[PDB]
Amino acid sequence: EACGYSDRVLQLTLGNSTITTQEAANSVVAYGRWPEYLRDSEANPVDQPTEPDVAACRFYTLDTVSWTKESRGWWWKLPDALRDMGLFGQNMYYHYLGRSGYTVHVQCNASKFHQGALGVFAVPEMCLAGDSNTTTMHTSYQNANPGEKGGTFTGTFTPDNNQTSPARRFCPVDYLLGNGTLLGNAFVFPHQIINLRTNNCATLVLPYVNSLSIDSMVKHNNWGIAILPLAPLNFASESSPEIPITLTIAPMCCEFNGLRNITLPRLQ
Amino acid sequence: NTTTMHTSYQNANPGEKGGTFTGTFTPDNNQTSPARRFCPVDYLLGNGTLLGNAFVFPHQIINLRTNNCATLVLPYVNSLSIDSMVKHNNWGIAILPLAPLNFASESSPEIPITLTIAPMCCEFNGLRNITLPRLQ
Amino acid sequence: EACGYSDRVLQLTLGNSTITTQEAANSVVAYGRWPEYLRDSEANPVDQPTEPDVAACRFYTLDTVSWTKESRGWWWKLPDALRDMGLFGQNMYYHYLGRSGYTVHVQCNASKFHQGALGVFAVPEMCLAGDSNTTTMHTSYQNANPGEKGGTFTGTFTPDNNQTSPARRFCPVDYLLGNGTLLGNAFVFPHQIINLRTNNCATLVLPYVNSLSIDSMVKHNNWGIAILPLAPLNFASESSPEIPITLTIAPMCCEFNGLRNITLPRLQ
Amino acid sequence: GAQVSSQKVGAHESTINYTTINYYRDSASNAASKQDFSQDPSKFTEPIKDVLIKTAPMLN
Amino acid sequence: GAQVSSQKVGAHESTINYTTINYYRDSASNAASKQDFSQDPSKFTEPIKDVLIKTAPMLN
Amino acid sequence: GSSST
Amino acid sequence: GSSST
Amino acid sequence: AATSRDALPNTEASGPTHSKEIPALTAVETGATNPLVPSDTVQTRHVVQHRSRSESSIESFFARGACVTIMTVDNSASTTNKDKLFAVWKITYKDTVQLRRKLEFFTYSRFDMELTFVVTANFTETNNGHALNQVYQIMYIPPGAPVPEKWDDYTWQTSSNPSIFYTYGTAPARISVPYVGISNAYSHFYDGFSKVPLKDQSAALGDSLYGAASLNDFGILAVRVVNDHNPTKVTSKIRVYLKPKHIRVWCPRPPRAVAYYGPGVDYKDGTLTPLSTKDLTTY
Amino acid sequence: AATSRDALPNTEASGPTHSKEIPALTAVETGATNPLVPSDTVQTRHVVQHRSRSESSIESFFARGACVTIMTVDNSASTTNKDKLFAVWKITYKDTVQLRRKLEFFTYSRFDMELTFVVTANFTETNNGHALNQVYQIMYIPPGAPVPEKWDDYTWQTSSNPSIFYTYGTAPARISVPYVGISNAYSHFYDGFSKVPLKDQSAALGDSLYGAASLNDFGILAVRVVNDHNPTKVTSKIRVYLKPKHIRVWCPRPPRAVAYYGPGVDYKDGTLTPLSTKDLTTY
Amino acid sequence: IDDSFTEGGYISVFYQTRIVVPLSTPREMDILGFVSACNDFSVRLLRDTTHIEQKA
Numbered sequence A, C: 001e002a003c004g005y006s007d008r009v010l011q012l013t014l015g016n017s018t019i020t021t022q023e024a025a026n027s028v029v030a031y032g033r034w035p036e037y038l039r040d041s042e043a044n045p046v047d048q049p050t051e052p053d054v055a056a057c058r059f060y061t062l063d064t065v066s067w068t069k070e071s072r073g074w075w076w077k078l079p080d081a082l083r084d085m086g087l088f089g090q091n092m093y094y095h096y097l098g099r100s101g102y103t104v105h106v107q108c109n110a111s112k113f114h115q116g117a118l119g120v121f122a123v124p125e126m127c128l129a130g131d132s133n134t135t136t137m138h139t140s141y142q143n144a145n146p147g148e149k150g151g152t153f154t155g156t157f158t159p160d161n162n163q164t165s166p167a168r169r170f171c172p173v174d175y176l177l178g179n180g181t182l183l184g185n186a187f188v189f190p191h192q193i194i195n196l197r198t199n200n201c202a203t204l205v206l207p208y209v210n211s212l213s214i215d216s217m218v219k220h221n222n223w224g225i226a227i228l229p230l231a232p233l234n235f236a237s238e239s240s241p242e243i244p245i246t247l248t249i250a251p252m253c254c255e256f257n258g259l260r261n262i263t264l265p266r267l268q
Numbered sequence B: 001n002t003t004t005m006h007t008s009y010q011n012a013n014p015g016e017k018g019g020t021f022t023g024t025f026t027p028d029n030n031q032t033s034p035a036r037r038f039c040p041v042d043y044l045l046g047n048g049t050l051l052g053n054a055f056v057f058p059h060q061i062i063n064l065r066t067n068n069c070a071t072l073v074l075p076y077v078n079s080l081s082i083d084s085m086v087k088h089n090n091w092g093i094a095i096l097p098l099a100p101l102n103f104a105s106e107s108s109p110e111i112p113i114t115l116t117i118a119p120m121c122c123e124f125n126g127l128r129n130i131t132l133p134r135l136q
Numbered sequence D, E: 001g002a003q004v005s006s007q008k009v010g011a012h013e014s015t016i017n018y019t020t021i022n023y024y025r026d027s028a029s030n031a032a033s034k035q036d037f038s039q040d041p042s043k044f045t046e047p048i049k050d051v052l053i054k055t056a057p058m059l060n
Numbered sequence F, G: 001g002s003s004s005t
Numbered sequence H, I: 001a002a003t004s005r006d007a008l009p010n011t012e013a014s015g016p017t018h019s020k021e022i023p024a025l026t027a028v029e030t031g032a033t034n035p036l037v038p039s040d041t042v043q044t045r046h047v048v049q050h051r052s053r054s055e056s057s058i059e060s061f062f063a064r065g066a067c068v069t070i071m072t073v074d075n076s077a078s079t080t081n082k083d084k085l086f087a088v089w090k091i092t093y094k095d096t097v098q099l100r101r102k103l104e105f106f107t108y109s110r111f112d113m114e115l116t117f118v119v120t121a122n123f124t125e126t127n128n129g130h131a132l133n134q135v136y137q138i139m140y141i142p143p144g145a146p147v148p149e150k151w152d153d154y155t156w157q158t159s160s161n162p163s164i165f166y167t168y169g170t171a172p173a174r175i176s177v178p179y180v181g182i183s184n185a186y187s188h189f190y191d192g193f194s195k196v197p198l199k200d201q202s203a204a205l206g207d208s209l210y211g212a213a214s215l216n217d218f219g220i221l222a223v224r225v226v227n228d229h230n231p232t233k234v235t236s237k238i239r240v241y242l243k244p245k246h247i248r249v250w251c252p253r254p255p256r257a258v259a260y261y262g263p264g265v266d267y268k269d270g271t272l273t274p275l276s277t278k279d280l281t282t283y
Numbered sequence J: 001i002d003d004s005f006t007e008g009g010y011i012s013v014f015y016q017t018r019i020v021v022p023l024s025t026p027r028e029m030d031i032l033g034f035v036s037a038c039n040d041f042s043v044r045l046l047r048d049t050t051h052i053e054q055k056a
């Protein structure tokens, strides 16, 4: 626009929180669907829902991770990554059922002399593969659900051989997208790329997606966020460059059904 | 009786257990480490005014021959539209035996009292990190 | 504009002079008032005014100063800084009375690898403090009026102790804006900032401001220009960076009353 | 020559009014009316030549 | 700006009136009118949810 | 002028 | 007579 | 539209009764007071009631000036171990008891404040030496403004604080103040604290007085004799009278039954027996 | 047409946002302040705003009398080495500091001046001998009129100068003065000199004070006790209070941050550190 | 004035990611901060300041 408006410069405001960016590459709305509340014609639990509105639909910033030449990739699950985030987490553990959409904003700036590219993928039902070749489907709840720290990808499959006390964790191999399918095809999932010469962030607006209108947020993750270095970090001639990656995520249109006492999960 | 307005936050705020009234004023004399709690005398309504006049406050009486409950619907009342719930209490619930418990000829009768309370039309402003109060 | 017009790219033309800039941060019109000639309803001396128009209302460039890591700041007074500038100065010293507005254009370019920020303030009646703690209001005419060289600010008040032959000059301390008030508040005066990453110039259009419609230009200065490093100069890792600062100023709508022989002031 | 104006009534017990009569020829002798006007801060807060649209980039 | 109101005449010697003029801009400076209203005690004397009919059993 | 209550 | 503001 | 000076309801004549209508039977458990009138339980005549409740309207009940403090000042030569006496008072209605008790029939109030100042002076020492007529300065120092440390320091310039220069022997001084509360009403009772004690904080650091809200609720009056000192000593007292004009009140309370013991609702041992002996069946 | 006592704008309710509109990003280099309101960066509710800026209008900000000087006079027998004391004061607001600081938030002003005079007297010596009620003459001597050399000389006739004969113990005296400036506004700051030093002239001859314009800007007040002297000595002080009524101001300035040091903008060594220690990351 | 009952809360600034510079660039820099009132801002009860005095 002749009054300055740009595809690269955005402001997002949800609740008492604002994000600004001056180097965006537009933003994505997954499958073209904006988040919505559950409609009466698709409703299922009959009790009055709880809708925390601004108390939970606001931007929460997770722990910042670090991108280096040796980084193979990072992953998070939703709602799991937000389980300890203010009143969203509270509302989640007090109710049997919950549904929510999200604005996911991945942040990573550098300089005109750095280079590298992160593929940021939002995957519905991001089932990841386990570490065992003696057993299948055995990743424990605790290891499946890292909370805000997320997990990481590896370039090597390495099977857990301790049969006495199995690790029971995922072993998500990067070129296999951690699930036995080729990473080059992950672009059919809603995504953006942070290519440092072009942009310093990715913004994905995710609808609630599920085979049900509402479900157990504590038992089930609807979305997975996978971030992988499509082109590796590089800077000047430094052998060991580093730049930070920060995730800020906001729940949108979340509602909860089936209120009782609070869930106290076994997380370790 | 050596200090005024000195009941601590912790003792002022018992949470759900509440506190009790006493028939006797008994002054805290440990000046080294003061109790810092209330000493609410029943016939003085715990505040220096006569209990017989407490009926000007919104009330009901549970007289066992007549009824087994009291129901009070309370509006938000304050000199402000909204305030710090953690610093300030808007309402006090005081329950006192106007006529004492008695049963048949038992020397030691007992009956339970249960409080069930529901918030109504509550709204909150000024969201941040959670308050973690010093309660003990 | 879709035909290229930018807030950052300007051309100013007064008389036979043009200034171009490609890195402006818009321009300021002090108190929203553009310069004007004296109106009949506010007039006071009754003789026909002299209005030199393009002969004096043109851009004059003062001596360039140098900004370094040790620079505390610079100041100038108007009309004093222009007293020897072509026919403006001539018209000024031939008449008892004179009034004038100004376009002030401060120039300072560097590089995308330099950093620093100059606050450029136009102050109406910029009275500065003296060097003495035995006497007040004793700065001499000569020291009050440096002409185009201007004066400078200091980070330290240092009292003149020679009582036999007092220096009789100002001792303008930078964080006190040279006048006993805090520099952080100088932004209530009409101003711009030259922040080297953003812009390479400041442009202030100043109306004639005074408690009179017209006055003695030789006895009285209407405006003060104060330039102070809000954030210090820095470049790469050089210990001793330097970049130049140039002032170009144009009188606007100036008129003079009370013509006689020329004033020959004692300036040294 | 009486001037009748309204009070802005703060704590309350229609418009309440008050009366004023000037007793002297010189306006300097008069009390202050306190019937003052406000103005926009712009000449100090937005003294720029090109009007600022706050949703737009300030620099373009 | 004069305000004319009636007195409630107690001992007697038509309506007798009295006059009031406010001399100041601030309503706080004004005297008290004493022209006050009354209200029903109900919010304190009958604060019950279901209206009480006094000839009827209070409990039914 | 005059109010009459 | 009277002004009314 | 019913006014405070309107007459109360007429007694309507009423005759004998024999019905299922039971006005006299009721049930105070409900929390209600039985709205009866004499014709509900006895036979009445018609009476045209002239009486009104005019003098017990909230305004009329409070429409009096009450003494809230006495301030002492002198006009003596300041000398190395003792200075000329000026007085400082934190504005409150709780230093005396009568207005406090009346206000405390209610939980919250709004009103304009009328302050009247009665000033009296006397000689304290025997010398027949005289004094000339004193002028007093009553300065209102709102919370935040500099409090005077000396009878003659810079704060008595009052460029912004309101001051009254009162001349001795003239009419008692008087000013009005609007409702100046920072809340929508004045709180006669505040069941709370001005600080939340946090766990991650020391107890000392989270501590505050029970029932106190702003420390300096309304500020200070500072009073001085403006005159320089005489050879003879004169002491003066400034009695402050408070009247609440244009007043509104909310939430009624039982009145104070035992002696006040400080600014809070606290009571002292030994003062807790307001009621006297009287036998149940003795008129 | 917007008045000082009008309520400020309502907060309009506003929801979530995701657009190219960037209120929060700006550029202070331009010299402008970003005109934001809470609904620009957070979600808001609708609020009906009742608050007004009435008390901070220029008039309301200045609508107070401030002490600008104290004049001392006596009523003593004039004797060969010392005469009866009358006082002389050059009118100014710069002898005290509080009104000066308020006026100096601005470069120029116009106003009508209200001068109120508070007068106080006392005995200075021990004798029990008395004095009768004093009348004071406050004469305004405009620049050019003859200044009194003696408490009783011809100038106190005042055929043309305005005088106030004040009676002791009566209400404080008060007069008003129009805007009397010789310019279109009063200059709180004058960056200049009253003389141009010419080269063909000696330095002494072209010299003048920095920042001073007319030497006797506004003239003098001369005050005397009109009474003849008593056997006993009485000293009096006349405190002068200045209020700017009907005021207008131009060109705002940062307020005085370090102690005043004379009538100019000069500052003293040792007074230049107004700010106190506080750590960057300490609340 | 500082008063617990009318306390306003906390302003703070943090690094979201980090400042990144290329080579040949200063690794340290300043930010400056400014405060101003919005259009809904007002004050009342005039009083003398403590920011100026006149000892003697």
Ligand SMILES: CCCCCCCCCCCCC/C=C\[C@H](O)[C@H](N)CO
Residues within 6 Å of the ligand: H091, H092, H093, H113, H115, H138, H139, H140, H162, H163, H164, H175, H177, H180, H181, H186, H187, H188, H217, H218
């Ligand atoms: C020159 C004299 C000026 C006097 C100015 C006094 C201004 C302060 C008015 C104070 C208002 C006090 C109101 C009474 C107390 C409060 O109701 C309760 N303690 C709770 O807020």
Ligand SMILES: CCCCCCCCCCCCC/C=C\[C@H](O)[C@H](N)CO
Residues within 6 Å of the ligand: I091, I092, I093, I113, I115, I138, I139, I140, I162, I163, I164, I175, I177, I180, I181, I186, I187, I188, I217, I218
């Ligand atoms: C019988 C009493 C008569 C008193 C008459 C006083 C007349 C003089 C009024 C003086 C006006 C003083 C205005 C204040 C100062 C100036 O603003 C600045 N220093 C610059 O012009």
Ligand SMILES: *C(=O)CCCCCCCCCCCCC
Residues within 6 Å of the ligand: D001, D002, D021, D022, D023, D024, G001, G002
């Ligand atoms: C306009 O003023 C016409 C009405 C007159 C009303 C009564 C005036 C009250 C006394 C004023 C005396 C004159 C003061 C110099």
Ligand SMILES: *C(=O)CCCCCCCCCCCCC
Residues within 6 Å of the ligand: D002, D004, D019, D020, D021, E001, E002, E021, E022, E023, E024, F001, F002, G002
């Ligand atoms: C309305 O008031 C119009 C009639 C005026 C009647 C005479 C007023 C009496 C004097 C009041 C003086 C003003 C007080 C500030």
